[PDB]
Amino acid sequence: EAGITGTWYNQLGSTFIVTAGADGALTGTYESAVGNAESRYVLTGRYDSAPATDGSGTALGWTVAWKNNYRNAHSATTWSGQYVGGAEARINTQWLLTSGTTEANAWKSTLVGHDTFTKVKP
Amino acid sequence: EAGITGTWYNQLGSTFIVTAGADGALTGTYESAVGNAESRYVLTGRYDSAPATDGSGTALGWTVAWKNNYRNAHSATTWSGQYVGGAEARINTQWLLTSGTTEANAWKSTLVGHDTFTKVK
């Protein structure tokens, strides 16, 4: 079993609601805050559907463009990481958040960080 | 000949004024703009003083804390990269700029980017 499909929680107050297709597709909805449609965004990405059997995690990535019918931040985040199985399952990621900028301001376009996702909320 | 000591330039209008010590030290001054005392900052870092002889670049890194006698941005940049020798010598870097934040705002503390430095503007 891939173990990825379902609801995941970070520490920022966000929720990652994902379906892992048999073909390697990730699809679903990312929520930057709970309880409001204005905080819900489309996500799409890819995962390794045939991971190694040598104790290694499962490589994956996804994108959210921060535009929905309520808001547009002219920005997108990509998360790159791995799913780690077991009783304390995790998705461990690093991320890049790029905002559209003028060429003069491009040096300040991209934030970097990390997030750990869990099946139980902190 | 390490090839590193001297004045280097990047595309943001900054100047990297560096001395590479015999013992692996980088010291010098970083200018965020030319011809302004308020734009000059201390740098310190380290480099591989005995690089490979197989065509590989020379690993190095340095830090600037953005405080001097005129300004304080409560921030620091580190550059990590390699020096690449020859007739078109370059220092190719990626960098992390961290600002002091509260814990709630830490997600927005760190900018990432890349800069190439050249011996000619």
Partner: peptide
């Protein structure tokens, strides 16, 4: 609310 979502909302 939270810091990240507040930032998104402020962009309109």
């Amino acid at each position: 609310g939270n810091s990240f979502d507040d930032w998104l909302a402020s962009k309109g």
